[PDB]
Symmetry: T
Subunit: 141 residues, 12 copies
């Protein structure tokens, strides 16, 4: 039933943040779109956002304890955080990595995700809909 | 609206080919699943597979001229072919890269797609459903 | 005319912290010197320090919304944080990167700042006065 | 007299966290063993864990000001945090780096600790006892 | 009295017409005059020199080493290539400030690895023409 | 017992092709030598050559389904083709990589075969006899 | 005096293909322009294009057997194909590598040709005229 | 009507006696004469100059930028090492053709990474002396 | 009788006068006496041996593998270079503890990439001579 | 007739009990006897020698160079580390065949860059202990 | 027998230039020492110093034309100049590369001389006597 | 004044081994040439050669204890042995590295000596006279 959608640093800034790269959809609108999609798939979505690494670790620790699937857009921490990777290694339920922009069409340092090798799957560059497609995978699988 | 699903080398071997990596679904069954999904979304899917790089280039040139969206799993050529990349650079309509296995949880040489930097988006590790989720994105775009 | 001076990890430790590298000037002394210089330049300076990455992200988000220039010394996060770089990418007003020590005369890993490529300019190795020189540039711009 | 044992991200999760890698001992049980061993060696041990980088930095600053020895397991931050390295550089009393797992028998990125070069010594792969052996060194020195 | 050497390397005599979107529209002649005015306001005497010749640049910094005079150096393209220039700068006892008009870290990767930076007192980059003037102000506080 | 000898690009040119490197034996004479040696060992050798990657993949697919051993000299594709390595990964029967020249005594780029890590064994620099030695291995395995 | 001009993958697409990179001349027009220039220089150009590596290899083998010069634009295969390099190594008559675009002003991976080290020479970034200048090299060296 | 600058870098004045197995037996004087004869055939005016001095090469490039004239450049060894020379060439508005006598890709690895190639219009390598004349023919049909 | 083998490699017989700022002023003979005494208190028997010969070190490793005895190993310079010593240590079924006197990570870069660490049970570095004694304590508790 | 030197390096005397899943269950004594029989069937005389000492291996290679006898060499760990061994093998005028029991390319990265491979006639890898026998068969044919 | 001793950039600064690295012997004193050694060996030695690359090339050109041996300390140009290497490649008589300091005990960028591979031999770290020893080599050869 | 000349692996093979690389002078002739030159300089030279790393380490240890200068040609071990480098780090008297061939004109892996950074100086490619020139340095520096 329960799917955890977790957004990392700078993702609360969606809308005004680099619109050509990330789109004009706000995080509030993102939460509403995910919840609407989850209800139509018979799931429950809990969407959380934080710039704090310690907060992100706490949320996925809880998902590990509850054995709930995780949709994770770690933002910049994707490319840098071993600590977040280590937390995500506790997850028994599927972990789907999601990025709004095509991370492979940008700077070289964005192409070597710490999370990708331990995630079930990755969706990149499909904009805001990437979250919704990740939800659909978890509902159908 | 026509969507081109193009599969590269060894993808015609699906089902028998490394089941633990790629799953047990055959390419014939994949064709049927895509065509069923496309019919629900109001799209028309043309699914084709070849082990020949020249044939993949020909199919991509046609999609460039017709300005039709492309879903591409180039198999091994993903990691090697600059020629295929150059063919895909002609596409005006969206290009979605799809991989059945999590290419980032495997050998290091699989983590550096030549196609990702020029694709609209990439779906990795979500099995056969990656194709179907790519169709849904294209149904909204 | 508001200018934000943002200091990152370990900069609150100035004075006793590696004196041969960073000097004997405390953070409070630095705060006083900046405010004195800004007042003589007709600017208002707001100087804040935190060891928390999430906190630094918060302050630059504010400067982005208020369209205010930023003088940033991110400390160790300079060399490691993509998340901080992403937050700084929102800034429409000039961003000046400042370092007290000559970061190129030290360990090799300190020579590859994530912030330099997206900043307007960089001042390195001029001690505390680096902040004051960054202020003077902003007074003319 | 006073020894500071500081544990980084995900080390509060010991016990159920990757048992085959880190063992079945919880953090509560680890605190008890450390306190019992320190009392036998005529020392007082202060054991603290946090997933927050800023919190770790705060604890290091206090040890530097008090000139107290530090036994540090930074977790995933060991491989990533220059900020934590910088704080540890202020320590006048010995710094012993400790890891539960053999960090050299794992992923390549775990083999290049930021703390190792500025530490007095490093104990790796000797399990929970690594903490206790580090205590014994400090009792002799 | 208190003398500061401002030394510009290859292609810096071309300022104004040369890639204006990268280096600005101020000519080198205008830069010389601007530096001299700012220096005199700070109680300093700026000696501003430009050469496309490495040997000439070496000679100038050799003299600054003998006279123990501060140096503000924009070596241009040589910044990224010349060990010889670095070796000469290693003799300087008075402060050495490396200045670049453009933000070299926002450009090609080969520009991000200065040979001079590790032996300089400090580096000012990407602050345009004012970087020279700010370097002078540092030296005015550091006699 | 059937053994498949598969020769890749440029190997049909044996005889005239860089005689100092690859020898003076033609490809037709190679077929005759292998077939004579196979009859002596009580094996059945099918020797085939193609410059077409797709054709080589098809022959490997057939050997995978038939559970037949493969002796493969992929020529230039040894160093470049992930697609060919992917086809060879299907083989349940032993795969033995053969090269006429000493590929380690030439250009550096010839030293990093994609096939070697998944082959049973490799024979290099022993000339045309390398094929015959490979047959002899398979006759006892 | 026969000269083989061989074009690799995606070069049949000249005209529509990234005009800002490769120009607006079509492959049909390219063929005819090469043939006319060759004829004026007292040569005969055989111009062929294929997206198939095996086909390109066959044309190179034939050129090696006939000891005819090759002007080669391998396209994408320039940066990736050892098999093509191996075939070209059999050439004894001059081999000239030609690229329409300045391959050094683009992505890094385009700057490390497998063909360059074994070719007589390389012409890059001079557009369609690169083929014609390669022909003139051959005509001036008879 | 069109003026083209042929600029040769370090060691190119040594052509003829210099490593003949690599650069051929044509002297620099003979090269000048061959270029001027080809330029006269194409209806162009060719000015051929050679120097071992980097500063001198930079000066000639600056003049070509100011005059908006095409440049055929063989920088010799400086091709692989000089950012200063690259920066001067970036100021050119008329076409820049990089020319090398030897096949620079069939030699040492350090010769395969020209600083000038990315900012040039085109590059001709390994065709010997004729590389200069072919570069002239390109400029005759375009500029 | 639980036998622990303490094996020292090249230049460790030179302890005392050998770079005292790096390795301390304790001689190898004094080290042997300290290890043996510490082993006695823990209820173990320590066999301490040193050789500058790689072949000799390999023989001692082979013997310890056949006897299923724990090994405390300071391979010296060979730590950073010897695949052969790694291959021998791979036979050990009983725990292998890598010990270095100096902090090998605070020194030259080539000292930071041990061939032995990835196959050892654990590693003790930079704790001086006491690193041997702590390694014994680990084995006594295990 | 023809004398063939089969030289095994460090840890190969441990075959049988040493990592059976990697190197097989055949002991070194069993390997020696097998090689001797196979060679005698081919009209050759195999001298099989093993040592953990680099110096000892060098001496045996020196003797083969002076006698111009072929060498089959499994240097073990020294394959990936010893320039001294490569230098000794460079003296051999008769064929040198490098042999490894395990597929060294299916293992750790540091095992994939043999110092001996570039100077050997050929290499046999991953075919078990039969690799020695196939190497013998090559030498009997040449050649 | 005439020997050319050629010193490059910064070598005219000997004596006062980094005494701990290059010693206290001036360039004028070096010239006098070479004169004495040349007289003892029975040869002529011409000592030239220039900070100009073009000048150094000219002197090398003259030595090539006269087939005279060269002792070269190119200073900083040793590590940077392909042009100087190309000039030295013309020399038919022996070329001895000489450095006063041990270039291998300093910065990494000093360990990759462009001249070494085309020189007859190299003398490094023997101070000023390196010049005198190089002269003795040329007298005997 | 006693000077130690130490030759590593394969240097006993001089005259036989790759004569186009190392020359036609035997190690015995080298010994005699060194002893003659030492007598001219008022020095005593002890020239010893071994293919064994352990034996070379022992000789270096002896030279460290006696505070005697060392001329060292480690051969192949030059590029591989941290153990030998560690032994040489004990030397208080000067250490001169010598190579007969120009190590920088050969394979890349020969250009990164472990001994060079800790030696007083390095002499390369001056053939047999490299040893004699090394002797003259030590005689001039008392
Ligand atoms: O590297 C990234 C990628 C992001 C995305 O595409 O979702 C967001 C972000 O803040 N940082
Ligand atoms: O590297 C890959 C990845 C594939 C996938 O995951 O779809 C298929 C394939 O043949 N080769
Ligand atoms: O790498 C750095 C550089 C700093 C500076 O020079 O201001 C401060 C800091 O905490 N970490
Ligand atoms: O890379 C590591 C190593 C750990 C350890 O071995 O203690 C713990 C951790 O959380 N992350
Ligand atoms: O790489 C650079 C940087 C320059 C600057 O920014 O001042 C000038 C220049 O000529 N070359
Ligand atoms: O790299 C190689 C090696 C070959 C061989 O040695 O058989 C053949 C080939 O066409 N390309
Ligand atoms: O890398 C390239 C270069 C091309 C060219 O410039 O001719 C063509 C092409 O298809 N791929
Ligand atoms: O690297 C090079 C190449 C040259 C050429 O081929 O023209 C000439 C030169 O002096 N140095
Ligand atoms: O690299 C090392 C480290 C040693 C240690 O710290 O014990 C000893 C040694 O001889 N070589
Ligand atoms: O790297 C290796 C490979 C071996 C083999 O496969 O024969 C043996 C060995 O001791 N070390
Ligand atoms: O890199 C070096 C080395 C020098 C030497 O050791 O003679 C002199 C110099 O100016 N630059
Ligand atoms: O790398 C080398 C260099 C040698 C030399 O030139 O003296 C000798 C040797 O056996 N190995
Ligand atoms: Cl988007
Ligand atoms: Cl697209
Ligand atoms: Cl991806
Ligand atoms: Cl799957
Ligand atoms: Cl300071
Ligand atoms: Cl400490
Ligand atoms: Cl300074
Ligand atoms: Cl900077
Ligand atoms: Cl500007
Ligand atoms: Cl052959
Ligand atoms: Cl297999
Ligand atoms: Cl080119
Ligand atoms: Cl000893
Ligand atoms: Cl173990
Ligand atoms: Cl460690
Ligand atoms: Cl041989
Ligand atoms: Cl192999
Ligand atoms: Cl020479
Ligand atoms: Cl050297």
């Amino acid at each position: 039933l329960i799917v955890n959608v977790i957004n990392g640093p700078n993702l609360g800034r969606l809308g005004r943040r680099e619109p050509a790269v990330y789109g004009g959809t706000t995080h509030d609108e993102l939460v509403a779109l995910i919840e609407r999609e989850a209800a139509e798939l018979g799931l429950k979505a809990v969407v959380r956002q934080s710039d704090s690494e310690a907060q992100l670790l706490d949320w996925i620790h809880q998902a590990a304890d509850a054995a709930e699937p995780v949709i994770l857009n770690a933002g910049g921490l994707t490319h840098t955080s071993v600590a977040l990777r280590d937390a995500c290694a506790e997850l028994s339920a599927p972990l789907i990595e999601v990025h709004i922009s095509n991370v492979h069409a940008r700077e070289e340092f964005r192409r070597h995700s710490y999370l990708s090798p331990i995630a079930t799957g990755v969706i990149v560059g499909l904009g805001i809909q990437g979250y919704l497609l990740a939800l659909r995978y978890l509902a159908e699988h």
